[PDB]
Coordinates of C-alpha atoms in Angstrom, one line a residue:
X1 CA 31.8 54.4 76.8
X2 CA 35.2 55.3 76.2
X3 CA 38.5 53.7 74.2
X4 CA 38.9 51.0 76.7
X5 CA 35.8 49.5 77.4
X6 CA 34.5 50.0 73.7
X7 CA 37.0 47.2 73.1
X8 CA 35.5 44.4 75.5
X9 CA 32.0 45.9 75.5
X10 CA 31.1 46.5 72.0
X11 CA 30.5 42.9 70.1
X12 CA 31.3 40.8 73.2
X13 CA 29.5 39.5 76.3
X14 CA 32.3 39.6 78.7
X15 CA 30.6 36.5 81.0
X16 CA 31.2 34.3 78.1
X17 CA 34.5 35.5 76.8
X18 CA 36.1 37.0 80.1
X19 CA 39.4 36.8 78.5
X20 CA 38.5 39.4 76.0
X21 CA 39.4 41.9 78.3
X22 CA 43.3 41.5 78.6
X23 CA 43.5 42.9 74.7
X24 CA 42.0 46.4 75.9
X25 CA 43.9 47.9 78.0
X26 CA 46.0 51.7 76.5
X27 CA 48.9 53.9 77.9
X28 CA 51.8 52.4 79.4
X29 CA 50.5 49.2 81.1
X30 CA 48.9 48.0 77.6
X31 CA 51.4 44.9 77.7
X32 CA 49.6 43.8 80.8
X33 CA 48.4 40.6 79.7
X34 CA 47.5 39.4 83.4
X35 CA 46.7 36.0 83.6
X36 CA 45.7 35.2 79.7
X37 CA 46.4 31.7 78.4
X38 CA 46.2 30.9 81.8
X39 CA 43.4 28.3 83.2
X40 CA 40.5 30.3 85.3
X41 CA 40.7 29.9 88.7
X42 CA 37.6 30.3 91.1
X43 CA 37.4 31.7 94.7
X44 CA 34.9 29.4 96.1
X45 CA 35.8 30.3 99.7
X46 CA 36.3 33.4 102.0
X47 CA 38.8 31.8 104.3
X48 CA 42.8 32.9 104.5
X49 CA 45.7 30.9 106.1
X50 CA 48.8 33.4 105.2
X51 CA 51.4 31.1 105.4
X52 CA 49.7 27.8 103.7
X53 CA 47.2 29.0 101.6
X54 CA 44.2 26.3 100.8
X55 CA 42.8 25.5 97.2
X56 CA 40.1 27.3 96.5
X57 CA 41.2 30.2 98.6
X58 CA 42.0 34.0 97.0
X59 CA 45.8 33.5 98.7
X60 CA 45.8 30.3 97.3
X61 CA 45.3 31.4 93.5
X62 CA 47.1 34.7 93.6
X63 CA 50.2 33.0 94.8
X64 CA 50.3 30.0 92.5
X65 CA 53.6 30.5 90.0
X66 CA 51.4 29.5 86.8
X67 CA 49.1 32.2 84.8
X68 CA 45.8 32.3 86.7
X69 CA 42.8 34.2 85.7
X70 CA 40.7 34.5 89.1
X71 CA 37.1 34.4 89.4
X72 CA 34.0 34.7 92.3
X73 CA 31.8 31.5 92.8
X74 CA 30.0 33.8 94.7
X75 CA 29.5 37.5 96.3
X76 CA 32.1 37.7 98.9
X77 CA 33.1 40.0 101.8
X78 CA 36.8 39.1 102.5
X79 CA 38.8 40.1 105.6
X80 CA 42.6 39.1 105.0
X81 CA 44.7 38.3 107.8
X82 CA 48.3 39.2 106.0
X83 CA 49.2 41.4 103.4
X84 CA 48.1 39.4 100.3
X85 CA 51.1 39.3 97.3
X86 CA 49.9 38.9 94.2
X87 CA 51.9 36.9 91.9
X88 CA 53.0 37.7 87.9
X89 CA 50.8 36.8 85.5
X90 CA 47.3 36.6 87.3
X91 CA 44.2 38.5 86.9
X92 CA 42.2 39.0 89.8
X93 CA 37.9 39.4 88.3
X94 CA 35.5 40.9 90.0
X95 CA 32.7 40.7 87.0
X96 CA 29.6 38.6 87.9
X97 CA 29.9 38.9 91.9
X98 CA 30.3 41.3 94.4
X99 CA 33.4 41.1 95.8
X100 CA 34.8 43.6 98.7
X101 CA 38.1 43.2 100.3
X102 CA 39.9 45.5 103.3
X103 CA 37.3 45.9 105.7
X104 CA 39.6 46.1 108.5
X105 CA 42.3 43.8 107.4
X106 CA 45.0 44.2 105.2
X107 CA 45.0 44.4 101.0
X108 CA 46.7 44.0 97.7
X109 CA 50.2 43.7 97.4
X110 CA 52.6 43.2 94.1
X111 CA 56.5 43.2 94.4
X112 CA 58.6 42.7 91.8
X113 CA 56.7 40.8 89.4
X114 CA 54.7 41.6 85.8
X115 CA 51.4 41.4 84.1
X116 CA 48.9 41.7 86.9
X117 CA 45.5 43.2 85.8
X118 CA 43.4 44.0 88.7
X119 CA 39.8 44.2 87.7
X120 CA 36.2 45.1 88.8
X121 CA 36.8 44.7 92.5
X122 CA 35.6 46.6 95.6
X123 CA 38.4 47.6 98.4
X124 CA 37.7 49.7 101.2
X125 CA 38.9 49.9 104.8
X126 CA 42.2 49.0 104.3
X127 CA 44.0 48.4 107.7
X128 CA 47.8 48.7 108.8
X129 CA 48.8 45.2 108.8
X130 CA 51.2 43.3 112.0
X131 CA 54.5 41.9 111.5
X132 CA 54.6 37.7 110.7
X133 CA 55.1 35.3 108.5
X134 CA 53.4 35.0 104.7
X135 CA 54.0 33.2 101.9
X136 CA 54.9 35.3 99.7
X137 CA 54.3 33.0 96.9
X138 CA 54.6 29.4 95.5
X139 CA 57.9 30.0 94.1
X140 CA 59.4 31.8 97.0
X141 CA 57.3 30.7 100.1
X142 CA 56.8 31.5 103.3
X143 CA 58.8 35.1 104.8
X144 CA 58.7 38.0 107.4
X145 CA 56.4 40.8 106.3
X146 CA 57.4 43.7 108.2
X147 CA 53.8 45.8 109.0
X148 CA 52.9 47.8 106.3
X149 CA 50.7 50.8 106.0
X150 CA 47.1 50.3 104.9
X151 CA 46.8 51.2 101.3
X152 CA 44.4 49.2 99.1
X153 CA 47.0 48.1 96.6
X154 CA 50.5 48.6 96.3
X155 CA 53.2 48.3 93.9
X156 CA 56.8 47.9 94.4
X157 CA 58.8 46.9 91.8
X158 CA 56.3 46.2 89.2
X159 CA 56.3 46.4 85.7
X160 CA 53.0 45.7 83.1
X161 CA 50.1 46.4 85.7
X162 CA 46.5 47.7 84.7
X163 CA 44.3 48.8 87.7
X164 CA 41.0 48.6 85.9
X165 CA 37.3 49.3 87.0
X166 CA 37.5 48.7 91.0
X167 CA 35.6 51.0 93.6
X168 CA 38.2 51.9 95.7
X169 CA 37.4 53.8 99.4
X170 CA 37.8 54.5 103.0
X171 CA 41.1 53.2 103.5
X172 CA 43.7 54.0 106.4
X173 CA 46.7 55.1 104.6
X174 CA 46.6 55.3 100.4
X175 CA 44.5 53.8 97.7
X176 CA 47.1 53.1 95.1
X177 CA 51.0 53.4 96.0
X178 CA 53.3 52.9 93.2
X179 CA 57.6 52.6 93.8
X180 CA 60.5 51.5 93.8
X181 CA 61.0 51.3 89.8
X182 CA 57.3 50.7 89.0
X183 CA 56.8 51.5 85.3
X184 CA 54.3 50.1 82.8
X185 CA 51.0 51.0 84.1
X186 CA 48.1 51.5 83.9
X187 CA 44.9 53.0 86.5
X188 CA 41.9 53.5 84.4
X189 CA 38.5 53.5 85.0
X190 CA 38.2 53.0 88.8
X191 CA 36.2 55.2 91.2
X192 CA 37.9 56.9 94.2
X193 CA 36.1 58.3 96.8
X194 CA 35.7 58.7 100.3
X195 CA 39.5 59.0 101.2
X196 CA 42.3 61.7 102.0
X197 CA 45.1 60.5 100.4
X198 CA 44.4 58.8 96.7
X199 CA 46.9 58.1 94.6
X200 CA 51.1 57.8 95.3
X201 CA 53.3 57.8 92.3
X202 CA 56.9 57.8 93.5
X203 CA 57.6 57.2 97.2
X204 CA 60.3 59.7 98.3
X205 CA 62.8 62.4 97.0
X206 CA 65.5 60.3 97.4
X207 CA 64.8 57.6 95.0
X208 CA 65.3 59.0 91.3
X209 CA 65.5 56.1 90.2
X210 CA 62.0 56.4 89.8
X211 CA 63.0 58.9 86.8
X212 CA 61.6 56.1 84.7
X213 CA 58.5 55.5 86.0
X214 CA 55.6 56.5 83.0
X215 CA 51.7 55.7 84.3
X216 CA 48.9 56.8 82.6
X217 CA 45.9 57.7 84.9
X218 CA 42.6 57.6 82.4
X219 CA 38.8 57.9 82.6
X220 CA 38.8 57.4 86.4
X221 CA 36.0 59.7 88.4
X222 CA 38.1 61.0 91.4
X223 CA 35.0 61.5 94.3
X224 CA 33.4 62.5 95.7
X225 CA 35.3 63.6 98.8
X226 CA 38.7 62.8 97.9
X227 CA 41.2 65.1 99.2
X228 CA 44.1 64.9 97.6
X229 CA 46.9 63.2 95.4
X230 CA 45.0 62.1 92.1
X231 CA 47.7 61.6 91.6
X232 CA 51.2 63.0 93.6
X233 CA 54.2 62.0 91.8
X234 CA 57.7 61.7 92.3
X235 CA 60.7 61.7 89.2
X236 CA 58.8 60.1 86.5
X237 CA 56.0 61.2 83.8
X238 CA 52.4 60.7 84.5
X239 CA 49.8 60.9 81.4
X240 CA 46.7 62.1 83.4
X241 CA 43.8 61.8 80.8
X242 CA 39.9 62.4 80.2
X243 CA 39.0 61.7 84.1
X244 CA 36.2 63.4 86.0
X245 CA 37.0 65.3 89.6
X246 CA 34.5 66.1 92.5
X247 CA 35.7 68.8 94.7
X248 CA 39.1 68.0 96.2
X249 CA 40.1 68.7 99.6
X250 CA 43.5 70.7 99.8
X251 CA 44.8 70.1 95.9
X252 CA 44.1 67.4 92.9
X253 CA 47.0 67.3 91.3
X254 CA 50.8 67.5 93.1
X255 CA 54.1 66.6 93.0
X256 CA 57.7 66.8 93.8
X257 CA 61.2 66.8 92.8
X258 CA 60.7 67.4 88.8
X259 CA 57.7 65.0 88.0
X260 CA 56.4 65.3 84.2
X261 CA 52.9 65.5 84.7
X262 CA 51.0 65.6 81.6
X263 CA 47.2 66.7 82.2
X264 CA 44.9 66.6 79.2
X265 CA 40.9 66.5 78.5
X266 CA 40.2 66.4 82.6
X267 CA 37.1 67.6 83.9
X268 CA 37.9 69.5 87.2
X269 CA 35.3 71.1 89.7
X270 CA 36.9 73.4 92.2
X271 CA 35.4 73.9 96.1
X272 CA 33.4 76.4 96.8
X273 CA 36.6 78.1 99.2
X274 CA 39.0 80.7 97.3
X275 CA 42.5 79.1 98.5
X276 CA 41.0 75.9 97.1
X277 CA 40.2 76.6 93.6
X278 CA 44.2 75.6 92.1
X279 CA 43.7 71.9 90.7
X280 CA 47.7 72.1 90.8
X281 CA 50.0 72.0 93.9
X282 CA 54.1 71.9 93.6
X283 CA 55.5 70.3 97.0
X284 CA 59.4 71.4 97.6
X285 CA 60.3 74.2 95.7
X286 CA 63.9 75.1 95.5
X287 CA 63.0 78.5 94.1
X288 CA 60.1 79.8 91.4
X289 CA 63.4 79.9 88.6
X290 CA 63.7 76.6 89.6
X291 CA 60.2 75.2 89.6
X292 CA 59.6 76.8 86.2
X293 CA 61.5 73.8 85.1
X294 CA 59.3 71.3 85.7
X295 CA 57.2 70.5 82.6
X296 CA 53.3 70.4 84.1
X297 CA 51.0 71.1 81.3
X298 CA 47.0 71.2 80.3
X299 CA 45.5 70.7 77.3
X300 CA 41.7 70.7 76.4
X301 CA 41.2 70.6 80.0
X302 CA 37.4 71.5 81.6
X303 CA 37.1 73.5 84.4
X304 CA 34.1 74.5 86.4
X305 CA 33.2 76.4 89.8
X306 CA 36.7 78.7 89.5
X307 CA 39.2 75.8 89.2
X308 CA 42.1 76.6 87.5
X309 CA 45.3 74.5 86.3
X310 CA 49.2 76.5 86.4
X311 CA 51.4 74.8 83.9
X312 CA 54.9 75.1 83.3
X313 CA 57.2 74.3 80.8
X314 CA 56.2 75.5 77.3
X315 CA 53.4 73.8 75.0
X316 CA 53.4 71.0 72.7
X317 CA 51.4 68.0 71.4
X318 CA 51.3 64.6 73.3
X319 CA 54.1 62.4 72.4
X320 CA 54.8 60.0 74.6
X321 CA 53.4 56.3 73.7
X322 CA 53.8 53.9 70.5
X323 CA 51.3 52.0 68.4
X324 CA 50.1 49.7 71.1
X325 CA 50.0 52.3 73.9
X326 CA 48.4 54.9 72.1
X327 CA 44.5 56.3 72.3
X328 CA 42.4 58.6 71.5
X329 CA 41.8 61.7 74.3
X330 CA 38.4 63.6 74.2
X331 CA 38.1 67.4 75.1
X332 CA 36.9 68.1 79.2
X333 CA 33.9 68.7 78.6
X334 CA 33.5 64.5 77.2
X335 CA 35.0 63.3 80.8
X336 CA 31.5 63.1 82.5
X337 CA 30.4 61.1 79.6
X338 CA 33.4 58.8 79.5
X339 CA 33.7 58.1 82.9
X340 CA 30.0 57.4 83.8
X341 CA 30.8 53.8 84.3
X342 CA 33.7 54.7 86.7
X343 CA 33.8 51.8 89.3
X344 CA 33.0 48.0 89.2
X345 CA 31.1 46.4 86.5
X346 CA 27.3 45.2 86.9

């Protein structure tokens, strides 16, 4: 499969040691220990009361201040009525069930809490969500949410976070959006598709205090038809490693004011139209002397049907995580093969 999954797929059957999982995860959210030691928690009902959350509900566990790894009695379609926040220490599960959330109401939500793994779920249709009252968690309870765009998951504030395996879609604004001091993470494994704008990393020029942001985006398939942003960043330094793109829209890879963006055994397959072949796309150039600064580079990269990558900055070996962030990075031309189980587990 690839680094990641050999580690929970080799000698284990993950429906009888689901846990297993939390000691896989590489790159900069591989702290992440979502909700292990925790008890498991099952979703035995589709219902949502945002501001008093019933047991047995998915508001109801995601918001509970103790370590909750979160399960599926059943396959479940379910439509939130609020923004949902997600507390620290939990692990939503997808594996045994199918579970799909969005579809027309709002999504995932973390701010300014640790060790959330997000696993093996579906989200798609994603809506903008209406001012009122949620509880934001136990601990904190029940607050104005102002209306928010309609992004499948987003991050503000977060730190230790693996996005791992979901089937992510069709939604009205972004899939992932990471700011506001978001560092630690990890998006691996997932499968994008059907959706303009993917992947945020770093929300606006103004905030550089997102200069120490570090995300590692590995062995996702990007498509097909996504259009952009796999991802756009912002500040900080983005590991982009052995994923697998369908034809993009405008661009696949972007950014602004001085991102690090680290590209390195991707697979990329350019559109058939000429002014569409560039994988790479700098936003806000002061001046080429100036954008010559910003350290983009490829290494053992694929690319196929014309696409091409421009770097910048001059070349040198990846050295950017420690012992327990650290993983092995195949050539392009591996990427189909290690992301062919893109998506959520069956």
């Amino acid at each position: 499969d690839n680094p990641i999954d050999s580690c929970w797929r080799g000698d284990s059957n993950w429906d009888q040691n689901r846990m297993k999982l939390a000691d896989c995860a590489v790159g900069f959210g591989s702290s992440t220990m979502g909700g292990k030691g925790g008890d498991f928690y099952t979703v035995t009902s589709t219902d949502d009361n945002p501001v008093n959350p019933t047991p047995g509900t998915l508001r109801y566990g995601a918001t509970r201040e103790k370590a909750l790894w979160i399960i599926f009695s059943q396959n479940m379609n379910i439509k939130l009525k609020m923004p949902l926040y997600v507390a620290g220490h939990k692990t939503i599960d997808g594996r045994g069930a199918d579970v799909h959330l969005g579809n027309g109401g709002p999504c995932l939500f973390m701010r300014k809490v640790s060790h959330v793994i997000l696993h093996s779920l579906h989200i798609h249709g994603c809506n903008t969500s209406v001012l009122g009252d949620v509880l934001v968690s136990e601990s904190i309870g029940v607050e104005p949410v102002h209306a928010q765009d309609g992004d499948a998951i987003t991050m503000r504030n977060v730190t230790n976070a693996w996005i791992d395996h979901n089937s992510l879609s069709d939604c009205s604004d972004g899939l992932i959006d990471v700011t506001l001091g978001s560092t630690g993470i990890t998006i691996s494994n997932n499968h994008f598709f059907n959706h303009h704008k993917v992947m945020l990393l770093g929300h606006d020029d103004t905030y550089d205090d997102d200069k120490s942001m570090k995300v590692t985006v590995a062995f996702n398939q990007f498509g097909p038809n996504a259009g952009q942003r796999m991802p756009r960043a912002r500040y900080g330094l983005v590991h982009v490693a052995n994923n697998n793109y369908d034809p993009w829209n405008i661009y696949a890879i972007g950014g602004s004011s001085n991102p690090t963006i680290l590209s390195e055994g991707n697979s990329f397959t350019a559109p058939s139209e000429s002014y569409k072949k560039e994988v790479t796309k700098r936003i806000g150039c002061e001046s080429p002397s100036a954008c010559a600064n910003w350290v983009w580079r490829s290494t053992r990269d694929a690319f196929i049907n014309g696409a091409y990558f421009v770097s910048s900055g001059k070349t040198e070996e990846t050295n950017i995580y420690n012992s327990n962030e650290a993983f092995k990075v195949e050539n392009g031309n591996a990427a189909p093969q290690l992301t062919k189980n893109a998506g959520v587990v069956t």
